[PDB]
Amino acid sequence: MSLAFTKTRSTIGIVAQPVSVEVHLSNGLPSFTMVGLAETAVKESKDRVRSAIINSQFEFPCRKITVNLGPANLPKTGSGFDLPIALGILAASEQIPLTNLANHEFIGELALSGELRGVSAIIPAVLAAHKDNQHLIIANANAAEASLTGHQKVFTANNLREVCDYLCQGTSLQSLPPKPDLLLNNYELDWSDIKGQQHAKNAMVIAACGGHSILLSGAPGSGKTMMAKRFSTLLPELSETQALECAAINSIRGKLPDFREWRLPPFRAPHHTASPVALVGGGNPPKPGEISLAHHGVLFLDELPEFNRQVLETLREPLESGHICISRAAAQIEFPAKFQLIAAMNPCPPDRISRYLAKLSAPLLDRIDMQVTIHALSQEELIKPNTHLEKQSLAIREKVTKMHEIQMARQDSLNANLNSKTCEMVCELGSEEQLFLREVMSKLKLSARGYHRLLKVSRTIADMNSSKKVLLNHLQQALSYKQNLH
């Protein structure tokens, strides 16, 4: 009397639902029955698994094989269930040490020969396996795709016999390949570049250290895009989970989604024309928009006012929710879309000014926390090279990490996501600072949101100098990052 239990994943989409494979060997006539809403693609696993076991010089039981793909309420649309089933059968026949199986998760499609074949949609599987801290074994054909995850806890095999010998004799199998070291280091940006615009640089630094969204404004060719691409270097390095989640969102796009290196916080910048289906959602099938590839990264609304107002209105959903459900029909998918927003606008040179600025999305413009002006450096100043830049990016990055730790000490929310109650409770806002606020806002006719965003920015620059309490100088300097338009 014996039975075996084996674990695998069904990749119905971004999520990887855990699935338990169970085999029981009755002493009845040698049938092979499958339960658990097995589709045709998997209900036909019988003969292929049988031949794979036979052709690997194992013994196929002459007994009533019963297979259960739990849970029974969800259909098994995947195809990689074959290797878990074969391993379960071999374990039930006591040809394998059952003790080792408890810690391992298996995915694999086997040809009739017993050699493995690579299934599709493996990135969500490895993400889920890592989050569950399970040793994952997959077909060698998917090692190239698995490599971009940067794991050290995933193993690949060429044939079922190799998996059996790793289980028994500990052959350790072929691990996934080396690091993608074939790249240009420092992302060719690092920091300490951009010779001019000192004020814009430290404004960007404080925005990065916090979580504030910042809108750039200036003349063409003076800045914007350069600072935007440089910003990605200041954000702290992604943990394993964030990198794997970015890989999962990239993977559903199909193919090898992009061999543009990895593990850095993604920068996305859709063109202002684009489309509502490409920026957000997936339309008829479940796909993530560019808003979602920016998850744990930066979304750059390059030339903001040319965007469609409806898309900008939609953008307000996940920026606060953290995900944007796509209620297409009869079902929906989450697709997390939390990102550090950055925007760029051109002031242009009468009625024309209002007629142009009327296209600005007021709800999104009000949500954007920071604004700074970019001056042109003129053709005369660009001739002189960088002249001893003395790269210092690591200090600023560690400052970012320490600042985020300081935020987490109070609450998980960064200063940009603070509500009014928590914001007011955090800034001690002494008597003199209160009088200063009343004076300056008597001077400047701000609204409620303008007042609260000012408080949040002031608190951020207060944390810039390790001050438990805000001071008048902090608010005075933070005041320079507001007063939209003219």
Ligand X SMILES: Nc1ncnc2c1ncn2[C@@H]1O[C@H](COP(=O)(O)OP(=O)(O)NP(=O)(O)O)[C@@H](O)[C@H]1O
Q: Which of 12, 15, 264, 278 binds a second copy (CB under 8 A)?
A: 278
> Per this entry, what is the length of the chain?
486
Distance CA 83, CA 45 (A): 10
**CB of 23 vs a second copy, minimal distance in Å:** 7
Contact set for a second copy, span 414-453 (CB under 8 A): 419-421, 424-425, 429, 434, 437-438, 441-442, 445-449, 451
Task: Indicate whether 194 belongs to the interface with ligand X (CB under 6 A).
Answer: yes
User: HEC string of 242-259?
Assistant: HHHHHHHHHHCCCCCCCC
Task: Indicate whether 386 belongs to the interface with a second copy (CB under 8 A).
Answer: yes
Q: How many residues bind a second copy (CB under 8 A)?
A: 97
Residues paired with 45 in a beta bridge: none
Q: Which stretch binds a second copy (CB under 8 A): 108-116, 146-154, 166-174, 467-475?
A: 108-116
Distance CA 432, CA 436 (A): 6
**Structure tokens of 441?**
């806002």
- Which of ligand X, a second copy, none sits in contact with 197, Cβ below 5 to 8 A by type? ligand X
Task: Indicate whether 221 belongs to the interface with ligand X (CB under 6 A).
Answer: yes
**CB of 361 vs a second copy, minimal distance in Å:** 12
Q: Which x/- pattern, by CB under 8 A, does the window 324-363 give for a second copy?
A: -x-xxxx-x------------------------------x
Q: How many other C-beta atoms can be found within 10 angstroms of the C-beta atom of residue 153?
A: 15
Phi-psi group of 165: left, alpha or beta (phi > 0 → left; psi -120 to 50 → alpha; rest → beta): alpha
Buried-exposed string 32-66: b where 16+ CB fall within 10 A, e elsewhere? bebebebeeebeebbebbbbbbebbebebbebebb
Residues paired with 32 in a beta bridge: 65
Q: Which of 12, 173, 377, 396 binds ligand X (CB under 6 A)?
A: 377
Contact set for a second copy, span 38-97 (CB under 8 A): 40-41, 44-48, 50-51, 54-55, 66, 68, 70-73, 79
Q: Which of 104, 212, 224, 287 binds ligand X (CB under 6 A)?
A: 224
Task: Indicate whether 193 belongs to the interface with ligand X (CB under 6 A).
Answer: yes
Identify which of residues 180 and 363 has a Cβ nearer to ligand X in the complex.
363
Task: Indicate whether 254 belongs to the interface with ligand X (CB under 6 A).
Answer: no
Task: Indicate whether 282 belongs to the interface with a second copy (CB under 8 A).
Answer: yes
Distance CA 203, CA 411 (A): 23
**CB of 194 vs ligand X, minimal distance in Å:** 4
Binding residues for ligand X, rule: CB under 6 A, are 193-195, 197, 220-226, 363, 377, 420, 448-449, 452
